[PDB]
Amino acid sequence: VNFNLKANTTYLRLVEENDAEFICTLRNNDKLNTYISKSTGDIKSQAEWIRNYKNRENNGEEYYFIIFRSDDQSPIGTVRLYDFHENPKSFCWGSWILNEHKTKYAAVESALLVYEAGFSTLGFEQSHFEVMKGNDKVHSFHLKMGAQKISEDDENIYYIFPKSKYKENKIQYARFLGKLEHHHHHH
Numbered sequence: 001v002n003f004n005l006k007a008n009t010t011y012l013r014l015v016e017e018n019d020a021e022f023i024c025t026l027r028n029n030d031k032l033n034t035y036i037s038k039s040t041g042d043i044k045s046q047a048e049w050i051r052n053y054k055n056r057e058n059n060g061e062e063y064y065f066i067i068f069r070s071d072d073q074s075p076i077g078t079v080r081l082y083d084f085h086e087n088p089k090s091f092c093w094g095s096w097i098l099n100e101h102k103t104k105y106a107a108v109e110s111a112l113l114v115y116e117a118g119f120s121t122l123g124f125e126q127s128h129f130e131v132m133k134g135n136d137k138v139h140s141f142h143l144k145m146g147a148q149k150i151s152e153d154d155e156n157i158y159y160i161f162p163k164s165k166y167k168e169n170k171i172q173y174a175r176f177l178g179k180l181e182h183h184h185h186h187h
């Protein structure tokens, strides 16, 4: 598979071993990591994590991206599709992090591109993910875009996002993905 994921102000490309330092730094930023998993601050350890990740990628099992801002081609975060299953065909996503240098609407664009990748580039039917209780704005984001709060445990709320909702969102959210082919005008 090869991806061509770009929106208005951001673009995504697959993680390489050389992104290890950017990743270590991002994930060990205490302003960003309140609700994600602890991980190594050691660059070589992170390079190793990516090498294993690359085997999974080679076998169609996982796709992990650096998020870039288009205007200066500088890295602003991460996102991942992982843990694929069947009946129905489902993917998880997460590892979703944006730093201070993010564009304003990067969160919207990157989420949309995830769903482009999963539902159209990879042919899944459903998306699953979770968000820690307390990560209030992220709950609100996902509910707004159309995720369905299935359920929960002591830590998380568990969501699914159906392919059907992604197809509505392509029209409603077209302004985030590219320049419009025609604009609405009221007389």
Ligand SMILES: CC(C)(COP(=O)(O)OP(=O)(O)OC[C@H]1O[C@@H](n2cnc3c(N)ncnc32)[C@H](O)[C@@H]1OP(=O)(O)O)[C@@H](O)C(=O)NCCC(=O)NCCS
Binding pocket: 032, 033, 034, 035, 036, 095, 096, 097, 098, 099, 102, 104, 105, 106, 107, 108, 130, 131, 132, 135, 137, 138, 141, 144, 145
């Ligand atoms: C999760 C994360 C990537 C979200 O990015 P964010 O920039 O904080 O997301 P926001 O919800 O602020 O969305 C960005 C902007 O688009 C707007 N927006 C969000 N959803 C929208 C929608 N459906 N329609 C239109 N606008 C929308 C927001 O209001 C915000 O604009 P504002 O500047 O006017 O507030 C980021 O907060 C982060 O890295 N957090 C730490 C790591 C983490 O917890 N990851 C998630 C684990 S569950």
Ligand SMILES: Cc1cn([C@H]2C[C@H](O)[C@@H](COP(=O)(O)OP(=O)(O)O[C@H]3O[C@H](C)[C@H](O)[C@H](NC(=O)C[C@@H](C)O)[C@H]3O)O2)c(=O)[nH]c1=O
Binding pocket: 023, 035, 036, 037, 038, 039, 040, 046, 049, 080, 093, 094, 095, 096, 129, 130, 131, 132, 138
């Ligand atoms: C991606 C990555 C992970 N790790 C380590 C950290 C863990 O010990 C292990 C597995 O990581 P996880 O699967 O928990 O990845 P993580 O990026 O922390 O994110 C996941 O766990 C978090 C606690 C969050 O729940 C996260 N959820 C989301 O981001 C969902 C979005 C849609 O809001 C979810 O994807 O691997 C690394 O050491 N380096 C890495 O680059």
Ligand SMILES: [Mg+2]
Binding pocket: 002, 003, 004, 005
């Ligand atoms: Mg490409």
